[PDB]
Write a protein that binds this ligand. Structure first.
Ligand code: NI
Length: 341
């Protein structure tokens, strides 16, 4: 049974609600982005209308085999009428294809559903500037002040400078980057660009990247691993054992691995600056954990909400414990008292 925070009142709509069977009253199912916790339940046998971005609809057709007749892609930043209701899709600054959804209810209520997002001051100049929002369905993944991390641009600077130094010192070093979903593609594209290389990967991952509308992608990636000195592997293989096994397979081309694990936040963020980050090392293998986030930090989240001034907030993450729900409610009230709405 579908939980209340996935239903949009006064509509026939649900958001990210594919694992509940046939939801009573639902005439259109929205999907904010192609991450497994959100698409859970979709498959080639789904027979109701799915509304999403063009990039999400490419992934639905090629990776999940949803039939074409049920995929309804909408352009961004464009007023569209769905089943008699005005909607707008906005870029979420999450992974490729990820959107926020504005719903203009027939009674005059305006609802923003953020999906998963990394809030940014640029959103203060989208179509959100132009009218009031009554209800906010909010990605609260990092809603606590302990959750700090650097900008994406600082993290990519660190990765590029680290990889370029290592490979210039040792031209026989291989760089490996971990992945387990879409998102975070800048990590491996930025490193391969400084090295003058394509990124090498499995056929399965190449197929996924080919659905993302990245400019000039054919110039940037390949399935020919032998031609590439940046390799992608499953996140599970980014450990000393898995990396040793991979180095064996490269036929003595390489004598060292430098690997990256993009994570979200980790407790080593509560002590160490990005500049001071060091790897774990065993022999000729070194592994960096880098804090590349596609979700709002606490401060980014608080700025967005204090600018938007919603009348009511419904969290969509960390909703399963009383302690989490009470913590989030306290911060929402602080923010409103501080800003005066
Ligand atoms: Ni996500």
């Amino acid at each position: 049974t579908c939980p209340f925070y996935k239903k949009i009142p006064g509509t026939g709509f649900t958001v990210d609600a594919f694992q509940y069977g046939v939801v009573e009253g639902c005439t259109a199912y929205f999907l904010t982005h192609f991450h497994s916790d959100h698409y859970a339940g979709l498959s080639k046998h789904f027979t109701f209308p799915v509304y999403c971005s063009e990039i999400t609809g490419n992934l639905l057709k090629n990776k999940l085999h949803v039939q074409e007749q049920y995929i309804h892609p909408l352009p961004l930043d464009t007023e569209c009428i769905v089943n008699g209701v005005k909607v707008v899709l906005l870029d979420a600054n999450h992974c490729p294809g990820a959107v926020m959804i504005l719903f203009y209810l027939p009674n005059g209520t305006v609802i923003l559903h953020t999906g998963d997002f990394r809030a940014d001051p640029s959103m203060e100049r989208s179509l959100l500037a132009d009218q009031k929002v009554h209800m906010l369905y909010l990605d609260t993944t990092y809603c606590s002040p302990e959750y700090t991390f650097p900008s994406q641009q600082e993290v990519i600077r660190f990765a590029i400078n680290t990889a370029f130094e290592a490979v210039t010192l040792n031209p026989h070093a291989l760089v490996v980057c971990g992945t387990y979903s879409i998102g975070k593609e800048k990590v491996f594209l930025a490193i391969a660009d400084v090295l003058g290389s394509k990124v090498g990967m499995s056929q399965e991952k190449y197929k996924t990247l080919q659905c993302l509308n990245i400019p000039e992608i054919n110039s940037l990636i390949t399935t020919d691993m032998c031609s590439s000195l940046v390799h992608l592997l499953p996140m599970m293989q980014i450990n000393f054992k898995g990396l040793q096994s991979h180095l064996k397979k490269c036929g003595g081309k390489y004598n060292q691995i430098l690997a990256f694990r993009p994570t979200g936040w980790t407790h080593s963020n509560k002590f160490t600056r990005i500049a001071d980050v060091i790897p774990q090392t065993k022999g000729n293998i070194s592994i960096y954990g880098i804090p590349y986030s596609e979700h709002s930090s606490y401060l980014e989240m608080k700025r967005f909400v204090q600018w938007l001034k919603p009348q009511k907030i419904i969290p969509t993450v960390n909703v399963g414990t009383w302690k989490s729900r009470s913590t989030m409610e306290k911060y929402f009230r602080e923010w409103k008292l501080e800003a005066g709405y």
